[PDB]
Design a protein around this ligand. Structure first.
Ligand SMILES: [C][C]([C][C][C][C+2]1234B567B89%10B%11%12%13B85%14B%1158B%12%11%15B%139%12B%1061B%12%112[C+]5%153B%14874)[C]1[C][C][C]2/C(=[C]/[C]=C3/[C][C]([O])[C][C]([O])C3=[C])[C][C][C][C@]12[C]
Ligand SMILES: [C][C]([C][C][C][C+2]1234B567B89%10B%11%12%13B85%14B%1158B%12%11%15B%139%12B%1061B%12%112[C+]5%153B%14874)[C]1[C][C][C]2/C(=[C]/[C]=C3/[C][C]([O])[C][C]([O])C3=[C])[C][C][C][C@]12[C]
Lengths: 10, 239, 239, 10
């Protein structure tokens, strides 16, 4: 999923 | 001979990216669950590592070309190199004088024994400290240290990478920038580039060991519940 | 008239369960991410609530009959009542004098404004404080407070419960123990049982509002990353 | 899944 990663990568 | 304006731009951008993501005051450390000196150092070290992953993401995003990759390649690069980037960047707080990582007060002074209190063994800890000693003894210029982190992050030989050609081209440009910098700016650095490439190899064994030990800790829900969502996402195998 | 030995045993077991899971010294509070007075109180409040969920699990496990239920019913009961049990148990630190929850020093003194700093609105906060005032004014005996938490936890009317007959039989036995205790042990408590049943109804509206506000916060990965694994599991909808 | 809950419920 990578919800946090995707969001941090903007 | 000298470096091109493009090579100079790359170094300035990388040094700027590092200054933006590395805080020499360590003032944010007070916001973590406090250090307790079974598995008493786990909450503090989990928050320290979670905080450092955010910094690594921040640095990666400012590496020229990195943001142009697909989200998936950026994830694949970050997921397998984050622990290596943390080990590299930690060298800035590492001291040969006490063989520990000093981040301000004795509150944030981390020795091997403290890391043992987060569940780690000497199998990882002894080679980690030997790596820290060897890297500190290289007496890298800030430009070299920053180039080494970016070279590490842009390794196309990681599981899950799709655009291997693009990544390897980005890393090569960085290695040329590094080789040219040492040659032009570092006196006595004739054997340096090769020593730095060996440190990247050492990091693969450290990554290997860390992964094994993380897998062992994370399997127990009493310790896994102490981790942060970001740590679980980044070190987790749910890719 | 008097209570049976079975009713006395139930009260002693519940009071003992509460003493084992509620720490009057609040000494564990120093281990949480510190309070910061955007969404500055979120880390501390998440750790406080995560810690309180563990306590509620601990108390639930000592409620007579609860451990005999299937794992799934225990989860269903815990998932939908935990926030209500937290609201009930918090009343022990709530003070009418300052309209805040005092857990030792001003370090762990929580007012409405502090909870606003974890993302909550007056839509939840104003009825929460009115509930705390009303419950504190009931001046419940420790036996009653403990019976009320156990009655709340054993409500069969929760989503996901399978053995509704068994749960309702457990809760009824507890309500009889409560009605008999007030009658025999509480002077002036003629209207008390009914007032306590109304507080359980008030808790459903508080739960409703809390769920909405949690859903809103948890949807944003910048705030959800600050939560703990246990909070995500318990307040999350992945049942 | 409820990995933490199950474990805490022993
Ligand atoms: C084995 C450890 C990795 C643990 C991962 C873990 B521990 B446990 B659990 B806990 B959670 B899960 B498991 B293990 B795995 C994850 B945490 C080391 C790696 C670098 C070390 C260090 C760095 C210092 C600094 C200070 C400063 O230079 C900033 C820099 O970025 C930085 C991080 C000092 C302490 C021990 C470390 C974090
Ligand atoms: C709305 C709040 C719920 C937030 C859930 C949230 B906040 B945010 B985020 B953060 B994470 B997610 B969101 B919200 B949802 C989850 B946390 C309240 C509920 C009871 C309050 C309280 C209790 C005090 C005590 C002290 C003592 O008597 C022990 C007792 O057990 C206890 C908890 C004082 C502060 C505010 C509360 C926690």
């Amino acid at each position: 999923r990578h919800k946090i990663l995707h969001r941090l990568l903007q | 001979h000298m470096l091109s304006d493009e090579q100079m731009q790359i170094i300035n951008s990388l040094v700027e990216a590092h200054h933006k993501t590395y805080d020499d005051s360590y003032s944010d450390f007070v916001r973590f669950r406090p250090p307790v000196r079974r598995l008493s150092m786990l909450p503090h070290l989990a928050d320290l590592v979670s905080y450092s992953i955010q910094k690594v993401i921040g640095f990666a995003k400012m590496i020229p070309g990195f943001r142009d990759l697909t989200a998936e390649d950026q994830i694949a690069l970050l997921k397998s190199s984050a622990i290596e980037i943390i080990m590299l960047r930690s060298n800035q707080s590492f001291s040969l004088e006490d063989m520990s990582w000093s981040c301000g007060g004795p509150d944030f002074k981390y020795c091997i024994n403290d890391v043992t209190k987060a569940g780690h063994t000497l199998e990882l800890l002894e080679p980690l400290v030997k790596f820290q000693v060897g890297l500190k003894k290289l007496k890298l210029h800030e430009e070299e240290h920053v180039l080494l982190m970016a070279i590490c992050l842009l390794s196309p030989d990681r599981p899950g990478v799709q655009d291997h050609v693009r990544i390897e081209a980005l890393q090569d440009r960085l290695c040329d920038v590094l080789q040219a910098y040492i040659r032009i700016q570092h006196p006595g650095g004739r054997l340096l580039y090769a020593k730095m490439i060996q440190k990247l190899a050492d990091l693969r064994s450290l990554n290997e060991e860390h992964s094994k030990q993380y897998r062992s800790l994370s399997f127990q829900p009493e310790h896994s519940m102490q981790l942060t969502p970001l740590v679980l996402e980044v070190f987790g195998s749910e890719v």
